[PDB]
Design a binder for this molecule. Structure first.
Ligand SMILES: Nc1ncnc2c1ncn2[C@@H]1O[C@H](COP(=O)(O)OP(=O)(O)O)[C@@H](O)[C@H]1O
Ligand SMILES: [Mg+2]
Ligand SMILES: [Mg+2]
Lengths: 178, 294, 222, 305, 319, 228, 228
DNA sequence: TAGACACC
DNA sequence: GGTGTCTA
């Protein structure tokens, strides 16, 4: 591009050939299945009783547990996995549910910022800090405190919130609508 | 005393000193007793009834001793956080030579178990410069060797004398802030009907002005529906130990004699296994269905 | 062949544009970023006496600097590279040409749309500051009758609205507005003074930095 | 029969060299000649799953038979750093002459390797024109879905009763020739076909046992617990418990793993309640050795398989 | 004398560490299998694994080397991260010795979980220079050594002797403890206290010499100290007898006696009730005791929780 | 404003005490470690002409050194910092004051309990040796009629019994014993010569190093003994 | 004792062979890699006046370089090491001899099997090139009547078939073939010129580099082969 | 400095 | 989830 009649060179060639590894690294990353699609992929197997394995997959004991608890027919097994579920292999806790719940069919970040924000300013727990968001959003509407306390957003502070570009998106969001 | 800038009444009116707090007879004197010596030992302040404002007493004892004070949300006190900030704080002698006091609020959060054990050698490590004040809803969430290096002080059972006198204190205080905040007093039985409505929890009653009943659940169990119950469960996940007590209490009267023998097996068994149960919110859901059925 | 400290200086630079190179017998070397966004060409004082593709040019150059200057580079018996020292002999691999990206021909640069110059220490400040302010894109544009360069951090500012850096190259005679954006990642030129020739036809664009030692063409957009 | 001399283990030292010298089922053998004739090897994943069938052996020989320039890399070893440096080096580093470049990546189904897998799916888009990839797997699910796209996955195993009959024969005859070079003696030829039967699938297993027995230069693991639970006895279990007291967290993991397959579907739901409850209360339990005994009995009672 | 003395050591379980393979107390076969090794002079790749500490693993490793006049590299297995294996351990397996001394690397306590990669890196490395240098691994838990490694080694397993072997070792250990007392100026009043140490903690010959150090406080082992050794792991007879008799008053009273160490007691109990009761009651005694043990530490009152066990047992146990 | 090479020298040092700074118009700069254990103050030859908080002071200073000395720092149109060079213009962010830690006021230092001095190359040896011997705590104390500094490694020696390093500052006239312990982590002073002013009242204590360029007050550790 | 800049130069080098050292009173120092694969010995101009074991020899040397040259090292009152400067005193720990690996004695080197020499700048090229080509093993062997060194990368080439580097030391008179393999990781000699004495008996082998400042013996790998 | 692995 | 360790 600046050489007209170049050949083709897909995303992957350009990466690997030039040796910037962030593109290669991102080139690897793009191929992998979307987290949300995996979480859906799994829940349906237990349910509709179809094949799949994990360990090729991201697994939240919570998610399956929660998502499952939805149908009162599942609830007995969700319980056992609840009391007992600790220290079972993510893989085991998978196979319990599999041969356990018989039939089938099936059908915060931003707030965390606000909250861990509020507790740090007033030196209080994450418990009142919920009640503090409440007492404001209703009353006083609290963009007005979101105004004083936009002040402390420091870059270091973002890392305790979340681990990714999702954080610097927030950086601005709160520099914004108040 | 006001902090005339701050944005929240409980925060703007927080009693600065140890008298200005609304408390039990035996309790105020015990606390006077402590600050009297001008140096604070290791303390566990434990509730368990909420909104009695543990962290307020604490923030106070520090003020009466004129101590430099580091605050930590208990949720936030993690192993490494104790290793640097606290140790950074705990270690240095203060130019002004007050006592450094670490207040750790609500240390009965969960995986903090390990930071608790790190602290056993610590507390003996800096005794001159430093003391810790732990704030717990349930003591059994403070590990026993920590309980041992600490004064366990255990809050309040207002005497009937406390009751009345505290009550007058809560009216003349609440009166005084509606003053400063320029809010209108239309009736003086509406003030005192707040001081009564939620009594031992004043931090609560002031949070009402800045704007429970088990009825919602009791009603959903009769109706035997899930959507409502499933939703109500996470509401009470917070204090299960309190809620489960209130539940057995009001379901006992409202249900058949044969169902009383069963409601106890169900709730007893559930209560019994809480703390084993991974997800407490779900474990509570499991109770609700079990109950609506039987 | 033998390579002088100046040629290897040059070649080290080209290595930053593209990790490999294709050397052809003659006095002329050239390379292009794999992504085609930056091109360099130079005449050299030494004569290259055989066609060879080098896969890791940085590695090759490091090796060179470990030998004397008289070290005689020649084609190996089996075809790879042979660096022959007084008492020592090193062997470096020739690369399959089909694995290394080289330009086809030097295409003449179109007569310039705009012309200015950039002083050696200003180009240096720009690069250096760039790492510190985190300026990943720059714009050669017109302001108040002068040619300026404006740095932006495109991750934090998508539109290029907030200008973190500005440098004034010289006054501008014409009446044309042009906002020529360049990717910092593509400014590979070795430090020195450069005639700066800007050119654009519609969505097409390129900038040619013409220095004493070499030339660099680098893609824009407008 | 080929020998790589200077090799210690017989399984390393006798390594069928050609897809012909490999002992294989009907379709499987025809399949690889099918491939070795076209003189070029596509992107492949051979997966067993039952071990010792000859994955890594067919892989290496497919290179041979086409006279490949082979780069052989084990999967535990093919690392975020290796894929970028040597692998890329070899692909883009030029061999003159004929030889075709093929990168045999062995046992690439390994827990932490999934990033090294993605990085290669992209690699394949990058370098495929100039080389070709053969990955080897015990469990295909150890492989990301996208490598299972651009790779032809041929599945080993399951010789027909005809093939069984005729493969046994080849491993028996092939066992004679090893012992001829080795100076090992065959006292009984029914005892050699006792081993070609005993573990039949497993062609790699048969050769380690053979080394073991030549001690006198002639021919004649959770297993211990898994076996004692079937037998449902106590004396054995009671004794095995203290053995694993040391790492309970590890052992209890391995146990649920292998009992899951070996037991009935209804018993799976139970084995989890039993083991889950046990694991759950470890660290409460005073005597961990006994608490483990308590698990074993509980299991022998309720498990059936 | 008849006992090696490191003499730079006060700690005494280590002052007395056997220098050779004969001075080692081991099962009959493993001693001959080790004697066999030292005679030939070239040592194979061995794993010596306990699990229970104190059985001779790291003593035997050092002795094999002594006896062969090996050129020995002793190495803390925890320190073997992969770089150390590529570096200094390779540098050593490769080197040519020359004193004409067989090279041995002893990797002590090599059973760590995350040294898994250093382990995979040895499986190639062990074959490559097996001509030159042999490796002795010591471990408490063998599963922490990868299979491909076990497979490259003779795995000799300590601490499970035959009853015949167990007897001979306890005779030799007693004999040893004596010879060690002799040299330490400890007077032996009753010999019963010395055999009680050997039996009390048997598999482990470290604690066994450790307990002995513990008791010389008054430099005598008199019956007054023999009285001590009986008590710690002592007779469960009083309870065993009260369970047969199925009475409560006795059981109720015996419970608070053992509240102290429940973890030890409950172990001794299951041990002796197993033999003395019916086969059907064995399956039950485990459910009962297992369930009890399992919930100790949840239980508020441990003394009562023990009472609850006793009744439960007297009811369901038959003999 | 413009900043001389001396001012930025100073400022870079303060940056080691605290990553940010609050600069106020005038000839006076100051900072304190976030943890309050070390405080620095200096008069400067340049005049700061506007209030500004800088979040990363080290980054800001790096940029400065990339411009000519005449480069004119001013308030930006939108409020951030504008460094204006001959041909170039740089923009650095002003920080919300509520995010950067500052001392309230410069509290006068109490008349000294003890006075001594430390020579530039001795303070250097002390710092340098300190990384090598692993001395993480030092004690200014009295021995044989002289003021000495003793280094200790507190991880390996809890009581400060084994003295790894000793440096002799000068003789001591008074009769008082004082063992003043300081945390190496808090000796941030830029190299040079320092009047050393020790002060203590009971469990309280502080040491003020007074240099030509600036002053540093640093807290004495809990274990400190003395009869002052 | 006092240590000159040359002695500490030497000592820093030995420190690369083994992290500790055992110094004995006399003019002779020596060390050996813990794995026994490389041994060094040197006569020094300074006289060592007391036996001492040093656990981190690199650390010790770093400290030294922070004192004047006249700094007088002596035995400490409590036995550790005392480095005494004009105005300052440093204390470095003596180590338990039982924790530091030392060679037993200096065993005489067998009369050489082969003798050659290596020039200071050739030894340097070899080391330097070695990092760049990734040559981890070298072979001193015979080719065309001359002693050459051949480098190989043993990870990518197991057999030592492909030769990445070759250096010609000098012609070879004898008729013997010897292929003497050395592990690069074991060439620790300080740069300079070395008489090179090769020796082998059967599977045994060692190479002694004999320099002006010191000597180094280093093991030939098990795969070395010969006619000796 | 992350992610993989392992144990609460 | 937290904490620790190791390899990259
Ligand atoms: N199908 C086979 N034919 C011949 N030999 C085999 C076969 N399978 C295994 N072996 C023996 O085992 C050795 C290695 O086998 P490999 O193919 O690695 O086993 P796996 O199936 O687990 O990959 C070979 O050298 C060979 O002697
Ligand atoms: Mg294989
Ligand atoms: Mg041991």
């Amino acid at each position: 591009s600046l050489f007209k009649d170049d050949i083709q060179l897909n995303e992957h060639q350009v990466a690997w050939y030039s040796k910037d590894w962030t593109a290669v690294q991102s080139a690897a990353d793009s191929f992998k299945e979307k987290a949300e699609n995996e979480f859906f992929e799994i829940i349906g197997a237990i349910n509709n009783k179809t094949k799949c394995s994990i360990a090729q997959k991201d697994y939240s004991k919570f998610m399956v547990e929660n998502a499952l608890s939805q149908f009162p027919e599942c609830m007995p097994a969700v319980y056992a996995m609840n009391l007992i579920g600790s220290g079972l292999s993510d893989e085991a806790h998978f196979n319990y549910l599999m041969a356990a719940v018989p039939r089938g069919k099936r059908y915060d970040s931003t707030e965390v910022l606000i909250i861990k924000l509020l507790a740090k300013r007033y030196q209080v727990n994450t418990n009142d800090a919920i009640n503090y968001k409440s007492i404001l959003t209703k009353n006083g509407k609290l963009p007005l405190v979101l105004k004083e306390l936009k002040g402390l957003v420091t870059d270091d502070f973002l890392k305790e919130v979340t681990k990714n570009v999702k954080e610097q998106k927030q950086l601005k969001k709160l520099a914004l609508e108040w | 005393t006001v902090n005339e800038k701050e944005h929240i009444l409980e925060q703007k009116y927080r009693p600065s000193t140890i008298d200005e707090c609304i408390l039990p007879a035996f309790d105020k004197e015990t606390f006077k007793s402590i600050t009297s010596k001008g140096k604070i030992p290791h303390i566990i302040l434990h509730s368990p009834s909420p909104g009695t404002g543990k962290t307020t007493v604490a923030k106070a004892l520090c003020h009466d001793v004129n101590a430099d004070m580091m605050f930590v949300n208990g949720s936030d006190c993690k192993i490494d956080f104790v290793r640097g900030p606290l140790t950074n704080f705990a270690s240095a002698a203060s130019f002004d030579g007050r006592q450094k006091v670490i207040v750790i609020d609500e240390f009965d959060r969960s995986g903090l178990a390990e930071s608790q054990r790190h602290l056993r050698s610590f507390m003996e490590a800096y005794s001159s410069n430093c003391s810790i004040i732990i704030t717990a809803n349930n003591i059994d969430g403070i590990i026993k060797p920590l309980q041992s290096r600490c004064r366990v002080i255990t809050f309040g059972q207002p005497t009937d004398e406390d009751k009345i006198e505290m009550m007058k204190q809560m009216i003349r205080r609440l009166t005084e802030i509606c003053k400063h905040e320029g809010i209108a007093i239309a009736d003086m039985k509406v003030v005192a009907a707040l001081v009564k409505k939620n009594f031992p929890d004043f931090r609560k009653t002031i949070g009402e002005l800045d704007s429970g009943a088990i009825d919602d659940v009791l009603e959903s169990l009769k109706n035997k529906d899930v959507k409502q119950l499933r939703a109500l469960a996470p509401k009470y996940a917070a204090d299960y130990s309190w809620f489960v007590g209130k539940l057995a209490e009001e379901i006992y009267s409202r249900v058949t004699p044969q169902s009383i023998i069963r409601m106890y097996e169900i709730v007893g068994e559930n209560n019994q296994y809480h703390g084993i149960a991974a997800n407490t919110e779900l474990h509570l859901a499991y109770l609700f269905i079990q109950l609506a059925c039987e | 062949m033998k390579l002088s400290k100046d040629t290897t200086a040059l070649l080290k630079n080209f290595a930053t544009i593209n990790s490999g190179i294709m050397l052809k017998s003659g006095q002329f070397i050239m390379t292009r970023a794999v992504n085609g966004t930056t091109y360099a060409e130079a005449n050299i004082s030494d004569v290259i006496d055989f066609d060879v593709a080098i896969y890791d040019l940085n590695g090759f150059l490091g090796i060179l600097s470990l030998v004397n200057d008289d070290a005689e580079i020649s084609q190996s018996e089996d075809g790879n590279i042979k660096i022959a020292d007084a008492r020592s002999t090193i062997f470096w691999p020739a690369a399959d040409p089909s694995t290394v990206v080289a330009p086809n021909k030097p295409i003449p640069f179109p007569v310039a749309s705009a012309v200015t110059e950039i002083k050696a220490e200003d180009l240096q400040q720009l690069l250096r500051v760039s790492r510190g302010l985190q300026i990943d894109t720059i714009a050669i544009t017109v302001k108040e009758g002068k040619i300026v360069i404006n740095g932006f951090n495109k991750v934090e500012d998508s539109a290029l609205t907030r200008v973190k850096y500005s440098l004034t190259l010289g006054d501008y005679d014409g009446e044309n507005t042009f906002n020529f954006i360049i990717n910092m990642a593509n400014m590979k030129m070795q430090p020195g003074n450069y005639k700066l020739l800007l050119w654009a036809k519609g969505k097409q664009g390129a900038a040619k930095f013409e220095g004493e030692h070499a030339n660099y063409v680098v893609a824009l957009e407008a």
